[PDB]
Amino acid sequence: LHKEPATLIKAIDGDTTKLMYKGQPMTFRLLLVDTPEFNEKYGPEASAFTKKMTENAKKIEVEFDKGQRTDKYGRGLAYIYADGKMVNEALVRQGLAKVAYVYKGNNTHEQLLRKAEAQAKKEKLNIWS
Ligand SMILES: Cc1cn([C@H]2C[C@H](OP(=O)(O)O)[C@@H](COP(=O)(O)O)O2)c(=O)[nH]c1=O
Ligand SMILES: [Ca+2]
């Protein structure tokens, strides 16, 4: 896989963001994770976490996987990086997202994220508290 440039347009919630990619506004949905909705327990915390990480970033990048690049809603499906650190993985490591929606052929970082989830669960963090 490879990283490509994007810039943040606006934060949305814990697992969706509005980015400009190849010069066009797109909503991205983070591959392989599920944050709580804002109206759910840890939803506000997840939204705040992804907002901080993406707004504070000097450099946002998107990394598509090998399979579909947009979902049925027209959201881009990618791994999102903020100054080289993957937002998807960070969310899972802090217990603010579960590994979820692992479809065959867009699951390159599955095991990295599962290892993070295991550490978050061992630490009884947030969703695992
Ligand atoms: C993460 C992800 C979600 N989706 C679709 C499946 C779910 O359909 P349904 O809307 O029919 O439940 C929805 C979950 O996204 P959200 O968690 O943002 O709601 O997004 C994909 O199709 N591919 C993906 O990789
Ligand atoms: Ca969600």
Side-chain angles (χ1 to χ4, degrees):
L1 306 190
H2 66 282
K3 286 170 193 52
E4 297 173 63
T7 52
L8 176 67
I9 300 176
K10 206 65 134 49
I12 308 171
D13 77 347
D15 58 21
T16 58
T17 182
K18 192 111 217 171
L19 307 178
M20 188 183 295
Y21 169 65
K22 290 192 172 191
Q24 301 306 327
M26 284 173 69
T27 297
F28 282 82
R29 172 63 167 80
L30 298 182
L31 279 178
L32 301 191
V33 306
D34 193 34
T35 50
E37 300 300 319
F38 186 79
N39 78 301
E40 292 163 5
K41 216 186 163 205
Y42 303 109
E45 290 74 13
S47 290
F49 179 99
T50 298
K51 180 182 143 82
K52 191 191 163 145
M53 182 164 182
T54 55
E55 278 176 5
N56 286 6
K58 300 298 130 107
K59 165 181 167 171
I60 299 286
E61 293 169 284
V62 301
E63 180 177 62
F64 293 107
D65 208 316
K66 307 292 202 155
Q68 93 167 183
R69 295 188 169 190
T70 53
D71 66 17
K72 64 204 224 171
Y73 297 121
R75 302 181 299 175
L77 296 167
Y79 306 105
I80 298 307
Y81 294 84
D83 293 329
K85 309 161 260 210
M86 198 203 306
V87 177
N88 313 49
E89 187 192 15
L91 274 162
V92 174
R93 182 58 182 89
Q94 289 312 309
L96 289 169
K98 292 180 185 199
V99 180
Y101 292 107
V102 179
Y103 301 87
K104 199 215 165 103
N106 264 350
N107 73 334
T108 293
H109 298 309
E110 185 181 6
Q111 299 295 324
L112 185 68
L113 261 47
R114 292 200 184 275
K115 170 66 170 286
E117 182 171 280
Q119 295 158 137
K121 197 172 311 179
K122 181 194 293 57
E123 303 163 13
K124 290 293 282 253
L125 284 181
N126 290 317
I127 284 176
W128 306 113
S129 73

